[PDB]
Design a protein around this nucleic acid. Sequence first.
DNA 1: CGCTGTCTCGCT
DNA 2: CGCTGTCTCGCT
DNA 3: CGCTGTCTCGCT
Length: 231
Amino acid sequence: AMKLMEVSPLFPCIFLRRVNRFVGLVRIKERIERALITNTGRLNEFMIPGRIGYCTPKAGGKTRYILLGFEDHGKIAIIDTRLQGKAFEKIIEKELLPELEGCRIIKREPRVGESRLDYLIECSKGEIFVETKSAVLREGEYAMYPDCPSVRGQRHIKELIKLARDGKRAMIVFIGALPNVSKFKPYKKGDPKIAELLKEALEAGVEIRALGLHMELSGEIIYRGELGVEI
DNA sequence: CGCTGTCTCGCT
DNA sequence: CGCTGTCTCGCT
DNA sequence: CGCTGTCTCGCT
């Protein structure tokens, strides 16, 4: 339980509906407002008229707010994948992760094959390719991925398979940005092949980790440690 | 994802 | 498709 | 470098 960073200001909202995959309508202080959604997943378990969400204002654009997360067991599940990215950057920088206790980000969205992976990190040892994925689909004590078929996600895992096999370091970090979870596993029904490809990748030396994060009402983003991975 | 309009399922 | 926001191109 | 205008990218 380390404090990673704070989101300010942070406002409770009532979720009304999605206008489209990038925009939700929320009610804040009697007013109806448009909120950016940065998470391509379905989030059907979260995106239900009436549930309490949490937003933060921004300047400009076609939306005045960013929908960051939802009430979940008294705290906050973080659905915003840019915020998840920042919390992961902070983890690296502060060296709170055992696998990377002295490393730095040298490139973001570095090109591999005909795709782009998330990070190129530099260890004391050598070069490492880290891809992150949002795991906010719950089953009991498990945070899971995905909640729908991701053809983009298949090909990304393949690049990690094609890199590892061919003598390169390749990692995948599932961000379990839910409170009250201690394990990760893939949701087979969400995508049949990503389950398969995860074992295939796990066999080819591709490191697979999963982290536990939540947000408090204060806006405080908390890292809870690694989740037990069960690929 | 939600977008239109229409057409499809088993179990109660 | 258009939907957000921010990113990337060559040639002039 | 910034200069015009237009046309190009993946990921969210």
